[PDB]
Amino acid sequence: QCVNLTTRTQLPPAYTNSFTRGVYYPDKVFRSSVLHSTQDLFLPFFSNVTWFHVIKRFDNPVLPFNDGVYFASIEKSNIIRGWIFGTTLDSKTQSLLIVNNATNVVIKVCEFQFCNDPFLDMESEFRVYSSANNCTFEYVSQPFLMDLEGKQGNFKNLREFVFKNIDGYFKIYSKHTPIDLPQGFSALEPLVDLPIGINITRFQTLLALHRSSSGWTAGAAAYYVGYLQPRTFLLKYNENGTITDAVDCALD
């Protein structure tokens, strides 16, 4: 439980840039054929994002969380199936688990004592923590199914996620679309709101592996984590009320 895999190799953190992607709906109010101006926690355009790729060439460091990050992941063999959240990621403080264990997306905020490298190993037995007590928040979302078959090749799906923190509330945005980095424009729809009210400073990726504890491998996947700043955007609505374009005022 406490011992991690010794057969893992950490990739160096190179840097890429996002073209125009990273725009979500700022509220739950419908608008149509307007040019709305608002200032929320967004990503500036042409900014440096950190490159990650899993192919024994793993890439999972402990990234800091100040105000907001993005999870722009592309997958073929469904490696990224969860994310951990918390302050120091141990049992002395609260730790948020958002785990998709191929039945549902389990959301629980207990005191999970994490190991040096939490990972999943279809799923045989999901064990990343040794003890859990003094739990606070529980949630069961819509059921979804995952697979752990070994696939390597061209990516054909894009799953973008938004993890923000405003007044203790953790809003989750999501967008699923088919397509090492996609270009163009997208728009992330609101999924669920989490009124937890904790302090989160660091996070890490739950990479799911497949095939005693030495012959574990994984497929091909990649994800990108940036950093957000409270910038003002222009918001162009069409006749159907979908986001078509955006303008960063702190860019050009």
Which secondary structure element, helix H or strand E, spans residue 162, and what is its range?
strand 158-164
* Residue 184 is a binding residue for other proteins (CB under 8 A): no
Sequence length of the chain is 252
* Residue 26 is a binding residue for other proteins (CB under 8 A): no
Find the shortest distance in angstroms from Cβ 183 to other proteins. Answer: 26
Residues in 107-146 that interact with other proteins by CB under 8 A: none
The stretch near other proteins (CB under 8 A) out of 54-62, 163-171, 198-206, 237-245 is: 237-245
Given 6, 9, 28, 133, the residue binding other proteins (CB under 8 A): 28
Quote the CA–CA distance of 192 and 105 in Å, as a whole number: 12
- Quickly tell me which residue has 């992607």 as its tokens: 21
Given 6, 9, 212, 240, the residue binding other proteins (CB under 8 A): 240
Burial of 109 (0-12, 13-18, 19+ CB in 10 A): buried
Quote the CA–CA distance of 80 and 39 in Å, as a whole number: 31
Given 10, 17, 32, 48, the residue binding other proteins (CB under 8 A): 32
- Over the window 144 to 183, marking each residue x when it contacts other proteins by CB under 8 A and - when it does not, the resulting string is ----------------------------------------
* Residue 214 is a binding residue for other proteins (CB under 8 A): no
Contact status, residue 94 vs residue 132, Cβ threshold 8 Å: no
Find the shortest distance in angstroms from Cβ 239 to other proteins. Answer: 8
* Residue 30 is a binding residue for other proteins (CB under 8 A): yes
Contacts from 169-175 at CB under 8 Å and sequence distance 24+? 169/193, 169/194, 169/195, 169/196, 169/197, 170/96, 170/194, 170/196, 173/24, 173/25
Total residues at the site for other proteins (CB under 8 A)?
12
Given 13, 14, 31, 39, the residue binding other proteins (CB under 8 A): 31
Chain positions contacting other proteins, by CB under 8 A: 28-34, 189-190, 239-241
